[PDB]
């Protein structure tokens, strides 16, 4: 398929593990919003979207409930064919050229994720970091796999060591990807 | 590893030349196997794998389900695109261009720009550098900004990095020296 | 079609009421509406996959549930006099498709059970002036002094219910328009040919089905308990 | 609501009823729905559409090119088509996404065609026992039967019965009172032959 | 506030 702009007005995801679900809209590969299925709230990912765009989270909850039904049927129809664990590839880089003292952001891209059950954390000098760690939703791909991006806002210093730990069922061990300056 | 059963429903819209060519494709995916899809160019549900004959034949029989999915070309694809014209298609983030010696290799770090259309050229002394210039594919930061790094093998002269972008009527010209 | 039970209910202030609804076979989305003469037809809540979706602006007293068979059950707690209404249930194949309504459940909240009265039915024979001037004979039925408005009037001629030439008032008339729980009055007309009325073998009976109290209600009054009953008035033809 | 309708609308039997409806604030993701309710029964689904013109076995829907107004066309109006017609826009609004919020609607009165209107007021005697009612019948469908001034006097509204055995239709109203001074001549005295 | 909609999903046979 060829097009100038591709829009995913309905990236509906539901998996038996959890069970967890996800509803989100994407345009040109960027997540417009996701719907927090637990709080029934639409979370737009740009300030311009929050002031001009609106979406009812009840439409998302209804589709996911249909996905829960549809999943139970294709499980029975496919003789309970479980998913295949893929090997995710991890890339770490900065958003802007790092300047000491100027706050930047580290970007941990975890690509080729399937099933959408990944556990991504940051480490500073070997210590787990639980501050400034943001995370995107599972962003769809054309081959029906997913990729997730984790962020880490930091302050550049001389003795800084940052690694992105990624834990997935397709990996034999937790994958540590060090960030080379 | 625990077993997992994944289900995906992708309601995808395709646009070309503004609103002249609009296409709707709703994909139904078990794990990573798309078994049924509805193509607005076709107009009816069709099974992609032998896992969706029961679904495609049944959804095509429900008259209102088929007609509403057909009407989603106007209620979803065409309607939401008008809101994109007010917001997404007007987003213009100017790129930040920085030249810095690598740690000889000069890099031209073009970061935080939108949309994806960009052009970067290296110039050694008003003569364009073809060989020795190594670029990266466009990088999606995930926060509606893109990034690209164009390196140049050099040996010292005023090296110049030119950048073009829709947000810029004037191309950004940065000299290293 | 959508089915709703019960069809008529009489409750007092403070009680609770459960309203059942079986949706159309295959439908999984159910919506509840309340129809009053005052505020019109108002939306309550909608249910799909055993969970509530869109919700109206009603207090927490108005709750509901949805079962696995897509059946729904609406509940109202601490009944007020303003809660008396027709509660309609609608179903759709899925949330977002065309909703199809049932017949509804008529709820009447009364101050006390003593305000429930059965109807008195009267049949008025046609006038000779109408018989001689138009060769037609109009019979008028009169059901008076009943409360609430849970009544079904029907005409029966020679044992069979008739519908040709029958006209019943679409809305009853309050005998005391100032009182809140005023008793009602209802009129109906059956017009037949003058010869059919002049046949002494033709039997004309006006039947009014009244829905009132059940056995779950106590009656401490001296008058007869106004239970669900059929009050009839009959008249024979005459030449 | 987003819809505005004429509160009442009359129509002659056999003619075509064109029920208008305005909805200039409709959006591209919202459908137009039409429902009707006969008496105090359940609302009956008529038709629905988006921008094209729809037609089912019941009626036809005509939506303007700019989608700012519509019309429900009932071609063959029967006396069974006398009902309240609700033009509803199924909105795409937060908190009410996909809800059908009913408005005041349009009261469509299908006036029957009385061929030979010979109006008269008759007095009927009770079949058992001192009781009697007055019957105003066989009047044209363009006449109004007003309520009573005396609260001790009760006057019903117009009622159209259909004698299918002769294809004969006739309007009728009833009046009664306990005050034995109730002459049927001065019963419907608020109804003057125009 | 007016909201945009996504693609509607149908219920399988089961
Ligand atoms: C996420 O962490 C939990 C425990 O903290 C672990 O059981 C699970 O396997 C992790 N997810 C992975 C490895 O994908």
TrEMBL record, chain A:
Domain Ig-like: 88-168
Claim: DNA-binding is one of the keywords in the record: no
Glycosylation sites: 79, 119
Topology with respect to the bilayer: Single-pass type I membrane protein
Cysteine pairings via disulfide bonds: 108-164
A cellular component term, taken from the record's GO annotations: endosome membrane
Keywords annotated in UniProt: Adaptive immunity, Disulfide bond, Endosome, Glycoprotein, Immunity, Lysosome, Membrane, MHC II, Signal, Transmembrane, Transmembrane helix
Localisation: Endosome membrane; Lysosome membrane
Keyword Plastid among record annotations: no
Main localisation: membrane
A biological process from GO: adaptive immune response
Annotated family: Belongs to the MHC class II family.
Protein name per UniProt: MHC class II HLA-DQ-alpha chain
Organism lineage: Eukaryota, Metazoa, Chordata, Craniata, Vertebrata
Encoding gene, per UniProt annotation: HLA-DQA1
UniProtKB/TrEMBL annotation, chain B:
The keyword Disulfide bond is annotated on this UniProt entry: yes
Ranges for domain Ig-like: 95-177
Membrane topology of the entry: Single-pass type I membrane protein
Subcellular location: Endosome membrane; Lysosome membrane
Gene Ontology CC: endosome membrane; lysosomal membrane; MHC class II protein complex
A single GO BP: antigen processing and presentation of peptide or polysaccharide antigen via MHC class II
Assigned keywords, A-Z: Adaptive immunity, Disulfide bond, Endosome, Glycoprotein, Immunity, Lysosome, Membrane, MHC II, Signal, Transmembrane, Transmembrane helix
Family: Belongs to the MHC class II family.
Protein name in the entry: MHC class II HLA-DQ-beta-1
Species name: Homo sapiens
Upper lineage: Eukaryota, Metazoa, Chordata, Craniata, Vertebrata
Residues shown, of full length: 3 to 189 of 229
